[PDB]
């Protein structure tokens, strides 16, 4: 039977699904370690920019887990994504070890902009800025891509890059009580938060795993953006971004939580 992970319920995705909003027709690029073929995922395509790993299959597990939060299929098995009918593209920019270069990430962002992706999920970061990365985020934004990125897991009061760049939407992590997870980076630039503790999702080997981190929070927001895009196909990346923020549930200080907890019901009503 299919389970609905706590985080999917918390962001109120089922209410959106009841309106017929599932992310149908919306192209979402997952810039990560790959996405492995899985009975609870439909992968529409992708590309790899990691030397030595020509396929988009996932040798780490991280990308597959992130992908299932966005779009695990609505059926009789596994779990359920925020946007179960979104069109997932696997853009491999990190290797099986979990590391990548700024060059590979920038190639992924260029690919997303050149190939019509509307949302790009970046569950990755670095404590250091890179002009190359900044330019790539800005270029993708100008081509219509909503770039969604994780705030980081150091627990500090400043956020990682690329999330810290203006044109990336930065996502922090909450726990089961809507508290900021202790590891979740916060501070100037934080846009919004989403569940990032004990997140069950798809994992390679046709199985499921529960993981923690801002990497897991981020795809809740990427998924919510796809729901808004399906409802409002003429809306631009920045319009979608602001609408998600404006309809978020305030949790207190914008410094700790940004606009608050993403709410897919409010964002699609």
């Amino acid at each position: 039977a299919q389970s609905v992970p706590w985080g999917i319920s918390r962001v109120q995705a089922p209410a959106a699904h009841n309106r017929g909003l599932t992310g149908s027709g919306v192209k979402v690029a997952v810039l990560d370690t790959g996405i492995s073929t899985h009975p609870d995922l439909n992968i529409r395509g992708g590309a790899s920019f990691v030397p030595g790993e020509p396929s988009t299959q996932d040798g780490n597990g991280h990308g597959t887990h992130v992908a299932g939060t966005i779009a695990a299929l609505n059926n009789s098995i596994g779990v359920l994504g925020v946007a179960p009918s979104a069109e997932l593209y696997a853009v491999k920019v990190l290797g099986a070890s979990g590391s990548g270069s700024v060059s590979s990430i920038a190639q992924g962002l260029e690919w997303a902009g050149n190939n019509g992706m509307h949302v790009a999920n970046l569950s990755l970061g670095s404590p250091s800025p890179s002009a190359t990365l900044e330019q790539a985020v800005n270029s993708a934004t100008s081509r219509g891509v909503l770039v969604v990125a994780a705030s980081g897991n150091s627990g500090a009061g400043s956020i990682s890059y690329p999330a810290r760049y203006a044109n990336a939407m930065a996502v922090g992590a909450t726990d089961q009580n809507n508290n900021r997870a202790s590891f979740s980076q916060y501070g100037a630039g934080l846009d919004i938060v989403a569940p990032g503790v004990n997140v069950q999702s798809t994992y390679p080997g046709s199985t499921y795993a529960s993981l923690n981190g801002t990497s897991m929070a981020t795809p809740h927001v990427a998924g919510a953006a796809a729901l808004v895009k399906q409802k409002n196909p003429s809306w631009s990346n920045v319009q979608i971004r602001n609408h998600l923020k404006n309809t978020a549930t305030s949790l207190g200080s914008t410094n700790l939580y940004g606009s608050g907890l993403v709410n897919a019901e409010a964002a699609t009503r």
Partner: peptide, 10 residues
Amino acid sequence: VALXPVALXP
């Protein structure tokens, strides 16, 4: 560097 598994530059 990095958050958990993803790092990129220092």
